[PDB]
Design a binder for this molecule. Sequence first.
Ligand SMILES: *[C@@H]1O[C@H](CO)[C@@H](O[C@@H]2O[C@H](CO)[C@@H](O[C@@H]3O[C@H](CO)[C@@H](O)[C@H](O)[C@@H]3O)[C@H](O)[C@H]2NC(C)=O)[C@H](O)[C@H]1NC(C)=O
Ligand SMILES: *[C@@H]1O[C@H](CO)[C@@H](O)[C@H](O)[C@H]1NC(C)=O
Ligand SMILES: *[C@@H]1O[C@H](CO)[C@@H](O)[C@H](O)[C@H]1NC(C)=O
Ligand SMILES: *[C@@H]1O[C@H](CO)[C@@H](O)[C@H](O)[C@H]1NC(C)=O
Ligand SMILES: *[C@@H]1O[C@H](CO)[C@@H](O)[C@H](O)[C@H]1NC(C)=O
Ligand SMILES: *[C@@H]1O[C@H](CO)[C@@H](O)[C@H](O)[C@H]1NC(C)=O
Ligand SMILES: *[C@H]1O[C@H](CO)[C@H](O)[C@H](O)[C@H]1NC(C)=O
Ligand SMILES: *[C@H]1O[C@H](CO)[C@H](O)[C@H](O)[C@H]1NC(C)=O
Ligand SMILES: *[C@H]1O[C@H](CO)[C@H](O)[C@H](O)[C@H]1NC(C)=O
Ligand SMILES: *[C@H]1O[C@H](CO)[C@H](O)[C@H](O)[C@H]1NC(C)=O
Ligand SMILES: *[C@H]1O[C@H](CO)[C@H](O)[C@H](O)[C@H]1NC(C)=O
Ligand SMILES: *[C@H]1O[C@H](CO)[C@H](O)[C@H](O)[C@H]1NC(C)=O
Ligand SMILES: *[C@H]1O[C@H](CO)[C@H](O)[C@H](O)[C@H]1NC(C)=O
Ligand SMILES: [Ca+2]
Ligand SMILES: [Ca+2]
Ligand SMILES: [Ca+2]
Ligand SMILES: [Ca+2]
Ligand SMILES: [Ca+2]
Ligand SMILES: [Ca+2]
Ligand SMILES: [Ca+2]
Ligand SMILES: [Ca+2]
Ligand SMILES: [Ca+2]
Ligand SMILES: [Ca+2]
Ligand SMILES: [Ca+2]
Ligand SMILES: [Ca+2]
Ligand SMILES: [Ca+2]
Ligand SMILES: [Ca+2]
Ligand SMILES: [Ca+2]
Ligand SMILES: [Ca+2]
Ligand SMILES: [Ca+2]
Ligand SMILES: [Ca+2]
Lengths: 1129, 244, 5
Amino acid sequence: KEFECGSGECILRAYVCDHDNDCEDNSDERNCNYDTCGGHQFTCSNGQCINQNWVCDGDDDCQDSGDEDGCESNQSHHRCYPREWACPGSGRCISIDKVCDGVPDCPEGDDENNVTSGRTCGMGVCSVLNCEYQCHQTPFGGECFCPPGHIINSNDSRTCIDFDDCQIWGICDQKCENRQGRHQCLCEEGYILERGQHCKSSDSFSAASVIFSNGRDLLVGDLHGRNFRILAESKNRGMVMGVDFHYQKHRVFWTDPMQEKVFSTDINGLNTQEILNVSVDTPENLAVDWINNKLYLVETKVNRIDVVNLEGNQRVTLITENLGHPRGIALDPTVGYLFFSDWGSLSGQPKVERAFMDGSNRKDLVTTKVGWPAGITLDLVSKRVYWVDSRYDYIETVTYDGIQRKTVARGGSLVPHPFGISLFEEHVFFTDWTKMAVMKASKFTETNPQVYHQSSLRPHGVTVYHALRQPNATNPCGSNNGGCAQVCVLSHRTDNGGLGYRCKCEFGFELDDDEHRCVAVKNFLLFSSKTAVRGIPFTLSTQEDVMVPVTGSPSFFVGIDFDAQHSTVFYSDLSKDIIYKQKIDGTGKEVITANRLESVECLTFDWISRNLYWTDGGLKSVTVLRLADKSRRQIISNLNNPRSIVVHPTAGYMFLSDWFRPAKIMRAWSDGSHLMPIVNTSLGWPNGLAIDWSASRLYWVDAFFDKIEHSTLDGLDRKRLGHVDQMTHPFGLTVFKDNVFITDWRLGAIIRVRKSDGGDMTVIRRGISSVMHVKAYDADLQTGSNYCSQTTHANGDCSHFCFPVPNFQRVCGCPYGMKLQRDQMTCEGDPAREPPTQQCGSLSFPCNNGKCVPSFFRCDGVDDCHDNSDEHQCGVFNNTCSPSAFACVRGGQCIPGQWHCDRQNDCLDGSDEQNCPTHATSSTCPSTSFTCDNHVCIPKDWVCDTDNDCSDGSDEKNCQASGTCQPTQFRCPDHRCISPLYVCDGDKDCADGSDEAGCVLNCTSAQFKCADGSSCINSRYRCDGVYDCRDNSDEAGCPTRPPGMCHLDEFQCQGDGTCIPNTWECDGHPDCIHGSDEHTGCVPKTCSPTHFLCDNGNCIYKAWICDGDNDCRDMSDEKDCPTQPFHCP
Amino acid sequence: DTGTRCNQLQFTCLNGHCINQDWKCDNDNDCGDGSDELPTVCAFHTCRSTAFTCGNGRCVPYHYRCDYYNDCGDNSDEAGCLFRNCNSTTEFTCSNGRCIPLSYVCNGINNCHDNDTSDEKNCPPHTCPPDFTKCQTTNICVPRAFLCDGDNDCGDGSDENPIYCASHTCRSNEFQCLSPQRCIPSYWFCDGEADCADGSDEPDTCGHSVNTCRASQFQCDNGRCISGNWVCDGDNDCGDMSDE
Amino acid sequence: XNXXX
Ligand SMILES: *[C@@H]1O[C@H](CO)[C@@H](O[C@@H]2O[C@H](CO)[C@@H](O[C@@H]3O[C@H](CO)[C@@H](O)[C@H](O)[C@@H]3O)[C@H](O)[C@H]2NC(C)=O)[C@H](O)[C@H]1NC(C)=O
Ligand SMILES: *[C@@H]1O[C@H](CO)[C@@H](O)[C@H](O)[C@H]1NC(C)=O
Ligand SMILES: *[C@@H]1O[C@H](CO)[C@@H](O)[C@H](O)[C@H]1NC(C)=O
Ligand SMILES: *[C@@H]1O[C@H](CO)[C@@H](O)[C@H](O)[C@H]1NC(C)=O
Ligand SMILES: *[C@@H]1O[C@H](CO)[C@@H](O)[C@H](O)[C@H]1NC(C)=O
Ligand SMILES: *[C@@H]1O[C@H](CO)[C@@H](O)[C@H](O)[C@H]1NC(C)=O
Ligand SMILES: *[C@H]1O[C@H](CO)[C@H](O)[C@H](O)[C@H]1NC(C)=O
Ligand SMILES: *[C@H]1O[C@H](CO)[C@H](O)[C@H](O)[C@H]1NC(C)=O
Ligand SMILES: *[C@H]1O[C@H](CO)[C@H](O)[C@H](O)[C@H]1NC(C)=O
Ligand SMILES: *[C@H]1O[C@H](CO)[C@H](O)[C@H](O)[C@H]1NC(C)=O
Ligand SMILES: *[C@H]1O[C@H](CO)[C@H](O)[C@H](O)[C@H]1NC(C)=O
Ligand SMILES: *[C@H]1O[C@H](CO)[C@H](O)[C@H](O)[C@H]1NC(C)=O
Ligand SMILES: *[C@H]1O[C@H](CO)[C@H](O)[C@H](O)[C@H]1NC(C)=O
Ligand SMILES: [Ca+2]
Ligand SMILES: [Ca+2]
Ligand SMILES: [Ca+2]
Ligand SMILES: [Ca+2]
Ligand SMILES: [Ca+2]
Ligand SMILES: [Ca+2]
Ligand SMILES: [Ca+2]
Ligand SMILES: [Ca+2]
Ligand SMILES: [Ca+2]
Ligand SMILES: [Ca+2]
Ligand SMILES: [Ca+2]
Ligand SMILES: [Ca+2]
Ligand SMILES: [Ca+2]
Ligand SMILES: [Ca+2]
Ligand SMILES: [Ca+2]
Ligand SMILES: [Ca+2]
Ligand SMILES: [Ca+2]
Ligand SMILES: [Ca+2]
């Protein structure tokens, strides 16, 4: 029943102690039952718990607007603090004692004398104002100031009312209070107060040290910069990028993106272990969880944030949605928060995010005027975050809720390009790619950086090694692993119903229905792209991956298929020309095959008989290989442009698509015999194939007609699915349950449609680069039995290959160079018909691995065979190195030529960097350009833009804030001088967008302008079927097909009303369902007597008939005449 | 030569019948004379790809492998088979590796079908009736229609063995078909249905004429024969309403 | 064109 408020209204109970009046009496707030609020909630001044996303949304959700409190920074700076004065011109709050001191401290000279506007430093009115404490002269009149604890009253400019000066920024380190004697600073336990205002760490916790990346090797130094010791040197041309430490374990961690590894040592410099080396191909930054003894990592080849134990086991992914470009990370295990930043998501907006320490409740903490947030650190006692930016070039701080945003340094002269940041006591230590040094700055307000240590190479993440940097706390997962089966990851202290932890499962498993139990994963979507092979769940809500992504240093992954009986996946790489096998957890990468592959465009698995089929676009064939033994034989030999294959183990059929001009889809026994077409009418570019295991129906897609079709295994009952919007160039297709997951090339995205009609196109992924394939991993589908895998039998009783055949029968075969025995079951040597041949021919070094490379690549310093065979034991008196490589003077070692004299020692003897011709001749860069110190040539407009272009910093030195620039440059307000190419480009390159404000969208006569004037797009994208404009004006007004008819230049099939292009009409091939396009009203083509033409191929010279080359593409020039020259040469 | 030719996919026997090529040299006398299994033909023949090849060279369908029925001849379809465990407390290990619950032992048929008939070392309470003949020591109690009939029904029991067929071409109370060998009783001879494939049980002239039948049976116009009480009884016995 | 590379 409704509550009876004192006013008489019947009030619903949901507002009882909602921290709102709800009526006049406020009796609903008389007694309150609220809790401490959740981690995903903000607490108002009244104690109200409101949603975290409502903070700084622009609406005063809490009474007194406690939820905004100046979310914006660089305000007009009105009502400056007591003992501070506002400059009328620039709005700059400056110290009162600096007014009329002789220094034009404000940029406009507002605190000094000038005659042009009658504001000299003369005293006029303070004699009558008579301030109760002190009256001082200003260029704009007399002003009054008061002792601490009061604010000058503008009501009369005489009095001062009481005020808490403790609120002002930088008054004291750590916390402060007004309890007695007005303001009174205080220091947290473990710290001791010094100077009255400063909090210093007690000497009971040992001296502090700061470890920073020199840019090539990890260093360590004292808190003043007297003695720097190289703790660890990166070997194999590596480079230390991120650094973090675990104090209790006396451990220092770092990441090496050029070696694609992460490491760990003691501070003594001993006991080094290589933690991770799989799938970590560009680790940016790092963070340890000293409370749960865990390591949080950031990867940016496939953007994700991971967590792993200090020994590198039980890796689990936490955040993988929408990251785009994550760079910074920081932790507060005592509270349970995880802070990270990215300089651009998959969407357009850069941001700084906050989340629980296992993902979960993500929230955009800072979203306005962000730029490129490059690094995050936390003040653990003041509960504030500190981050830097490399485009707007500032260092800012906000509280844990992002409320009070205050700049601590701003300007292209002070912080030109920060990367890393960490604070200690009264200082913040940040790095710099432009000033090339680790900088020390105050944490409250800083106007001049001090060079802590100046490098000759770009520095990287910095952390301060000290005990207080990692305060103690209780560990919720500290016993029984928190009841979690595999891995216990801390959440926010209030999450999981007060337990403070949530259970995860390693990549091979997933959580049970009742939680706390990890069972093997049954199914997930598996897709491939040029950068990585990934596995994602079908449920869109659980957007996190369920298998360690497969990545390589060169990589182009095309064809993929799995193996459920061993949790193993197969994948082809188009740059190695190699096929690999790898488990779901990332262990056991072994080459399946590397010999004689040109471009394998697909794989499939005949799981019952353990056969792997693949299609080669360079050899123009499909090969089958067994996994019990490395048997292989080209079962089909003379295709034209074959693409995705699929095999039906129980039915015994295999299906593959050729997209040459007479495109067709063929069916054959799993042996490779009976290859006949089943669909070859009205097909253009049949990229994808799949089988609907629930009904034994074959699905395929087209890229010429942009259609999806499905038929039975015989090609009968051919039906088209509905129109799918924005489907322009589908390549991959798979079928699961009642949905069809399709890869597309124009979108570069994975879309899902219903299996029974066109369906609702719901996008699963987007912006996944050159995405190629997709498979539906399922641990059930891969099951069954037939005569090739039957108990009481060995692989169907056939020596080597056994192949299923339609109508439940087995047919044996076996590899190249072996024919079938008389009994049709076993095999015998066949040297006469299929002689053995070498791994690969001459002019090619046969690697120990199957692959082989040209002999020019042997002993040249680059790992070409991908197993180091071509570099094995070089430099000896015969195995000389190639001239493209530099040979060390002794020792039989040699390196790529580009490493010779590159200021980095590689040769063991050190001859790599000796006697180099260091001096450059009397030569200059062109006169319009600029010459760096190291003689790099750059356009003059790049000078002083706060981006290091010379890689030396010579184009950014002597960059004073004097306001001048070059004539051609565009100057932002007090930020930097932009080159004129970056103004009016649609992106705010200044701190305020002034380089983009008020400029015309002048599309250059070859671009289509969106109707709303938001942007111009290239004319090719006009009306192609994909919405390229935000207003969808791109696809508006496009020419369309007249109702039921065809376009002006598309012949119509009289059989079914479809349209085929005019160039297909009377081409000799019956495209239409009934051959209407090959009516009698046209005559076949003929050829000259010196040439010959096949059934549909172009005419060719009579001289190469029967020659053994598929000149016609129709093989009829050879099948009409074997004519074997069966005689000795 | 009889003035006809078989279809191209049928092997033509020396006797003139046509059988599918898949039955050639399969250890099965399909032609009715063993012409399709002669070593003259099987020595120049290879089994089709989809089928097994026994050691002797004969061809069997693959589903005859490890089938608990030796049909390759040489036991090659059973050789090398790794059969499952047999639960002795539940099933009896037959001589061929089969195992079935022991309630089927001595039951009345050699369920295991092993060549020694270890299952059917009969232990019954005996006293089977004369019609349910005891097939000697292999005590299959079977209806008499399965004896003097040319095809196996008792293994090595009574069956079609000429021990009893030597008396009167069958038992004393039963006739024989004369092609193919098959024996039926008196009440099945001229009973209105041709049990004998040649129609010898329903001859051209039952009795001394078309419908003479027997000294105790009525004469129907279509040539059938019915008993004395069956005439005019109100039901169809002659088939053509000769009685009614 | 429909070329993977
Ligand atoms: C967090 O908790 C750990 C718990 O071990 C604290 O470490 C311990 O701190 C105590 C008191 O500072 C140390 O005792 C002193 O150690 C020094 C050096 O050995 C010794 O000379 C003194 O006589 C005294 O025993 C103790 O060694 C140390 N133990 C360990 C394992 O490190 C740590 O201080 C706490 N830190 C914070 C910020 O709360
Ligand atoms: C100043 O004047 C305003 C309006 O008269 C009044 O509300 C405020 O309390 C005054 N403040 C002081 C400190 O005099
Ligand atoms: C990677 O790390 C493992 C375990 O530390 C190590 O044994 C192995 O040699 C390393 N190399 C690779 C790439 O597997
Ligand atoms: C805009 O484009 C036109 C060509 O359409 C060009 O002539 C002109 O100089 C450009 N500038 C403006 C703002 O008119
Ligand atoms: C034999 O079968 C019975 C059926 O209930 C089963 O309980 C028993 O475990 C089986 N014997 C063995 C040893 O498996
Ligand atoms: C029956 O099988 C046994 C065991 O293989 C064999 O010794 C015996 O000769 C066989 N007898 C016949 C008739 O096959
Ligand atoms: C906040 O803490 C209190 C005291 O421990 C309660 O656990 C309360 O339930 C917490 N808040 C939430 C939302 O769980
Ligand atoms: C020395 O031997 C290597 C072996 O790989 C190359 O053949 C090289 O070309 C040789 N040196 C010269 C000068 O040809
Ligand atoms: C130096 O070389 C550049 C071309 O690289 C121009 O020719 C320039 O004028 C030269 N200037 C001097 C001083 O030699
Ligand atoms: C900026 O001012 C300095 C000092 O007067 C020089 O005049 C310089 O040439 C100026 N450049 C521009 C573009 O204003
Ligand atoms: C094409 O179809 C659209 C509707 O989709 C309009 O009817 C348009 O007028 C048509 N275009 C032509 C040229 O007939
Ligand atoms: C081929 O013959 C036809 C007639 O059959 C025409 O003459 C045609 O022009 C000829 N073309 C060539 C290339 O020979
Ligand atoms: C053996 O016979 C089969 C069935 O007729 C096939 O013809 C097979 O090709 C034959 N094998 C040989 C070697 O000719
Ligand atoms: Ca209320
Ligand atoms: Ca708000
Ligand atoms: Ca001054
Ligand atoms: Ca298209
Ligand atoms: Ca090499
Ligand atoms: Ca070098
Ligand atoms: Ca620059
Ligand atoms: Ca910058
Ligand atoms: Ca711009
Ligand atoms: Ca478009
Ligand atoms: Ca055509
Ligand atoms: Ca030819
Ligand atoms: Ca036969
Ligand atoms: Ca058998
Ligand atoms: Ca029995
Ligand atoms: Ca019989
Ligand atoms: Ca009869
Ligand atoms: Ca009757």
